[PDB]
From a paper:
Our structure reveals a mechanism for BAK inactivation that differs from previous complexes of BAK inactivated by rationally-designed BIM-like BH3 ligands that directly glue helix α127. The W(3)W(5) BID BH3-BAK structure bolsters the mechanistic link between the BH3 ligand binding-induced helix α1 stabilization and destabilization, and inactivation and activation of BAK, respectively. A caveat to this strategy is that an inactivator may activate BAK if it falls off and BAK reverts to a transient intermediary state resembling the BH3-activated conformation with a destabilized helix α1 electrostatic network. In contrast, the cavities in activated BAK BH3-BAK and inactivated W(3)W(5) BID BH3-BAK complexes are more modest in size (64–70 Å3) whereas activated M(3)W(5) BID BH3-BAK complex exhibits no cavity at the activation groove.
BAK is dormant in healthy cells. Autoactivation is mechanistically similar to direct activation: binding of exposed BH3 of BAK or activators to the activation groove induces conformational changes in the electrostatic network at the bottom of this groove destabilizing helix α1 to initiate BAK unfolding.
Numbering used by the authors:
A (entry chain B): 80 to 101
B (entry chain A): 22 to 49, 56 to 183
Write the structure that this text describes.
């Protein structure tokens, strides 16, 4: 589940970066 | 009732988001992503289009990285639901915001594109259901409804 955890962490980071930019 | 209208709108937003993400990747091919079924005079095409535009700066930076992690994950018809559910649940475990909602759409787009590129045709409607059903049952549709619906995304 290492890959699952990494994708989810990336998605939360990218999502938070977008949210801050908006 | 409010959640169900948001769920119906989510199907349109996701299909529009997929159409426009794919078109901009083509103008920067998956034939399943070149159709845009919408209800008459829908605003959800505009919503999906704008969400594909406003996430472009981040997405263009990281598209290769995301594709690489998907290659490692090796999603198939047999495991895609399990993997989608686990990843989406983790994404929202610490909260919901509009950026994370867009990240979920992007995940559905990249998952659908990846499986198609690896030979799995006819799966776009499956991923659409995964997205809609996840949002309905994991309180995302409720969060969107409390902000006035998907039209609130046009202010972003």
């Amino acid at each position: 589940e290492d890959i699952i955890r990494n994708i989810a962490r990336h998605l939360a980071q990218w999502g938070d970066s977008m949210d801050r930019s908006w | 009732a409010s959640e169900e209208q948001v769920a119906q709108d989510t199907e349109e937003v996701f299909r529009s988001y997929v159409f426009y993400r794919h078109q901009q990747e083509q103008e920067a091919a998956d034939p399943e992503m070149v159709t845009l079924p919408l209800q008459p005079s829908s605003t959800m095409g505009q919503v999906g289009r704008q969400l594909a535009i406003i996430g472009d700066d981040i997405n263009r930076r990281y598209d290769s990285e995301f594709q690489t992690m998907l290659q490692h994950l090796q999603p198939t018809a047999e495991n895609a639901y399990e993997y989608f559910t686990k990843i989406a649940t983790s994404l929202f475990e610490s909260g919901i915001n509009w950026g994370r909602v867009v990240a979920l759409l992007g995940f559905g787009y990249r998952l659908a594109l990846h499986v198609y590129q690896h030979g799995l045709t006819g799966f776009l409607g499956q991923v659409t259901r995964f997205v809609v059903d996840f949002m309905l049952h994991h309180c995302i549709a409720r969060w969107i409804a409390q902000r006035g619906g998907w039209v609130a995304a046009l202010n972003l």
